[model samples]
Target: ADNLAEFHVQNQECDSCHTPDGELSNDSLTYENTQCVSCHGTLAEVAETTKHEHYNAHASHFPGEVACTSCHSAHEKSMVYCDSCHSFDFNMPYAKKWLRDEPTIAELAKDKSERQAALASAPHDTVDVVVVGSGGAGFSAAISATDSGAKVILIEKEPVIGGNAKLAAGGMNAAWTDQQKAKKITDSPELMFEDTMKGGQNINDPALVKVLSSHSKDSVDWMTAMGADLTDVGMMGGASVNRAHRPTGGAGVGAHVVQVLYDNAVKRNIDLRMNTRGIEVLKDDKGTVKGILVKGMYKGYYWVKADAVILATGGFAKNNERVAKLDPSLKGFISTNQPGAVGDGLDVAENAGGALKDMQYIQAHPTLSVKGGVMVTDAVRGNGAILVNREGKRFVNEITTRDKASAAILAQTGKSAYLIFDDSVRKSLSKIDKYIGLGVAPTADSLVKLGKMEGIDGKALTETVARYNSLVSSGKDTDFERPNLPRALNEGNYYAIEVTPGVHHTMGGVMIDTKAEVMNAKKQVIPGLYGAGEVTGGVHGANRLGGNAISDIITFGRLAGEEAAKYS
Candidate 1:
């Protein structure tokens, strides 16, 4: 106010944006465009005169449909949402400057001094089972433990529950399920295991991988009985059959399944706490995990003693430094994981004498939108979209493994490529409208027009399509040797979507056995410690197949909970 008293402009109080009763005026805690532009002028107009790394930072964003509060806030410190996905490094006008640069994954993983102090001084509560993380695995563990007559406490670091599982747009892997049987498709666990091992480059633990493949069908059945809406089964890359089960009516399988699990957990009256971060795994003199030290909203830090501890805290794909430490080749790659996927579970478990494996194996998605690094579901290609380089040339077999596809894309001229599909192929895909709406994929009246829009050589595109159509006619692909030429790209209203590789999954974490028990460096199980989902290693050794992750989580999460409940 003193600075405002010396100036003509009056300083705004917190109530300027918030209500006198502490409620945000609009419930969003942000001013409307009319009120904002009255003070700061039109942001779209401001974007016109100002220069940004991207074309027009403000005007290009949702064509200014995005709220001002999305980036700027008065009640709390403002933040530039662009940094959440991109590395533009543009200094935001109203955003608060960081007191220190964001910590590396290794640093964030460790117990900092404040957390250690809190653990040392805080009181501890007891429970039968403490499930750390609130994703699919954690919820599954909580439900399983509760059903087994064990008191369960589930904690999540994020404000919301679902972890990376929430972002999944793909399907789950299962074999010999009722859904597959209804369609008269024959598949077995042996074939699934073989495909998984081949996709993992044969580096996965045979016993653990076997468990995932064998129990997948039952896991799918369990979830379906639990009210999950999985009704369709399709094929994904590295799968020998059409066993990837998904939600009916084009809904994302991840959202549907996670919602089901979340609702079930709530209905079961499981104690689920969000915005709670686990700092350390407390152990006894025998090095057996006894409890967890966690910091929670408003409560600072405390300890929770449990007869068993389930670490389902997911992987570290979003942790650039940690990922770099594991695989230097992915040093600057963007991630397609949730924000909380920073290896917190890995760190706490490591400190508690748990082992890690395949830490260097990170999965880079073959097809993701180059604009914001959002994963363009592999279903595009599975539904018959073909990837083309700038020269409008097809390089690799379209149905190859994800690793092979990612390598092919990275080998392209601009380290990126395009996926072009016709109207027929678009009609086959349920998410075509959503993709078009996001502007990630655009449609053109003709192939030449699509080439022009995507900056590809029109003549070259014509030849490429001609060559592909020739293969489709001959029922053979002599050039790239694609297994099956599903359909030709001769239809009008073509769509071209640019894509690139982004860090999608980490095929490494705290080591665990088939029983989901956390194992140590000496190859022994850590007593009272269990792990599931992406937090444990060996399910996918080097490269994770498209549909295996969901199977891994559900199959093993239930196992972890059941086993932990039996842990005295």
Candidate 2:
């Protein structure tokens, strides 16, 4: 009567599953997890054998390369890692009740003494570059650094990889790309920069915006060469053209891009540790950064010494209090972000002497489904859908920037709205099918029935459709001046997805230069430190355009890696 420890120790000594040096791991049980794989099989092979009907833990939506210690403990209880965000009950073998406590960043930010102790401790590991967060930004940085001949250590605070970027469902906005050319849609980096600056209310960093626009096309090709599909192009809000590159039928781009990065990272032998939190950036007495002090699930507190550190820990959308304090008007707003978007990088970056900008500008998405927080992609409206309030009146232009559209929807009668479209609109973008399958998008044979189902005035909704059809036919939106009229919504069943504005993207965080080098409050770059994606500020100034998050992550994330890899 015992656990895995008893079963294993019955035949072997302590060194059997450990390193020759008698240490657990350099990267959160990496050596032990490799031992597990050596004896059993690769995660993919195990997934193939024990495939579940609904989902497989071995082949989890998260990385199949996630460390085995994430859920299993030899002396302690086995807990389901996904249960941190999802409500999945797994009856693990040889289990005891899991005792858990995840500390907040605020708690970590205090106590200078605590920081000193961790910094004084010997480094458990060392690498050329240490990447914080495993989302699109972090993965891009990790992959880029490794490709540049730098040994990289990628760590995620959560039990899994794919930070908030895991939840990015829309396509990536890229200009003058192969996909746009394939679609014969004309666009340029200059046009993209203008659209982005104007869309962000003209406050975006000019140099940073140029870098994003100019490098966007190549980033897509970068992902494409890694086996990512970007053959399709579509329109998103705040763009001058159909520059949203995605999968074959406009599937989610963030997860796909991350999957490619994950596979490539594994192939390149980049070590990634999950459930390993970077609590503070370690610096020498010269006041220059040296490495990271991390709190581990198994290794306790240790130092990960590195020549360069890149912060890509994503936004603070999930930290409702932080968001509300930044912008009080959004005090009670629900977040469409995943639980891992807690702004831990902000704490780490600040402790590392990094600067922050535009800290108050948070973007609330216009179409977060009120039912279950499922985000309805902007391509829905870009295709041919209208947003209607409870009175069934079309409000703002459907293809408006996210901030403006969200404000309009919040100002509506119910602080919510419905995305009304027809079967033709649904057929245009394949992403709609996922919503349909999730039962978040309800369809009806009649527009009136669809309106009634969502508490909208059926007659008014019907008239709204008729008026919209006339505008599409006449090729001019006389009512709300909506642009990009793809077609009339007069084919098959009518549909509507009930939505309310929710905290989607935080437009600000740590500040960085064009090279993705983190800057201090004194307007100087922090040596040996870099930042990217939602963790850094000024990429999108006042607001983020639809589909631009991925662009920022890849473009600047790559630059951060490239720049960090060059340091010493």
Candidate 3:
């Protein structure tokens, strides 16, 4: 039964999976165990015989009940089912080699000519500023560029506007703010700069960090004036005092602030295009960026002419292949970023002579759901929650930096950890109801009940809670040296949320100067090109501190837009 069609040649018969006559009628004669395992062997046998301890080659929770077709598809790239929980680094064998019957040079040139003709025939729309993204940085750039009466259009490849900004829970960080003064907290931008540089191991650009710290308060005030409801403020990890500003009556800072920015963009009459993807950076003969080639959802491919272009396309956490190339240790790790965060602007920028730096320093969030990789927020730990392993033992200091906490979690037996808190801690959180609705955080009336629900030993959990409570009461953590004790886990109604570290942010990207101008290897600015937010590097060198992402985005995003608007 060899049926050939086009480039596909079926050399084998139907007997490969079906019967010789191809009438798979009865269950006993089906292609379940006989034909499937005849080539790959049984799952149980492979599980019992696999050599690696960390990798689950053939061993899994579902043995006979699971089908190979679930993970493996013919003529398609295979995915490991266990990758959802563990980093197994499974590589699927290629079933077939698909060589595209590409067109000749003359044919490609003909098609290009036809496209150019069609585009030239139509009236091309132009703008003064074109912002390539729709996150905090992108929106900030559009608004700032339009402030000078320049026409701006914000383009988002995804159907939605916000990038990872929509997923963030913690608030922005700023020093010497009116809120901080109202609370009688002593702080300054210099102190904030010192903390940020120290958190990044002092490799951050001094001038760029200074710009962020100086403009931090102004950016927060601008967002608040634009209708963001930020009222609550608290301390975050790596910061000496309470400088993080949380929004009131919302899921988190990201959700609330992004909405306000979106509404403000609409009010300002800034043209917003959704589902329009930027394909390349259009440059002039002198290598100056003139516009961007884009393909819209309904409209066909076209070039958007602009006087200036600002790239705020965010990070590459969701692009696992590129991330693995950057850092091999993060090969099979899950990401907590949105689907649109795939480093879409990297290639375009590089092609236009943009130099990328520190591409290997990817950061992982300390706490994310094991099920779907949703971030559990640092606010949980900031408001008194402790991390425990499967054995119900506290490992690292709860308020450690994100990188250290992620490393500690990965060092555990199953590469997993749990966030433990009591009813008091839950009541203290402003966004508890939002998390509870997501079904990631479950509640129990007692520590034993919570332990039973999480599959930890009841006695071990009880002892762990008692020990943590004693340390909180005594104001001294002998094990990990937690400087501050927020609260004790003495109250009932315990909650345990299973968590694991996942790729959260890329601290490495295209290089930019303090003015937000895209830079080359010679440290020269690429004219007419600007970058901000997670798409640009030299902000956070080795690791990113909590609550600094928004501040960095808004500060430089506004700067880039203001700078680009002056480009005539």
**Against the correct fold, how does model 1 do in TM-score?**
0.83
Q: Looking at model 3, how many pairs of residues clash?
A: 0
Across 191-310, the per-residue lDDT of candidate 3 in tens digits comes to: 999999999999888888999899999998998899876667776789888888887532378877788888888788777776577666777888887787666644556777887889
TM-score of 3: 0.79
Stronger candidate by lDDT (1 vs 2): 2
Question: Cα lDDT of all candidates, in order?
Answer: 0.78, 0.81, 0.77
> What's the ranking of the predictions by TM-score, best on top?
2, 1, 3
Q: What is the C-alpha lDDT profile of model 1 across 367-465, one tens digit per residue?
A: 878865688888778767888999989999887988888899999999999998888887766766667756678777877888888899888997898
Q: Please say which candidate is ahead in lDDT: 1 or 3.
A: 1
Residues forming the 10-long window of minimal summed lDDT in candidate 2: 81-90
Clashing pairs in 2: none
lDDT of 1: 0.78
The lDDT, on a scale of 0 to 1, for candidate 2 is: 0.81
Best by lDDT: 2
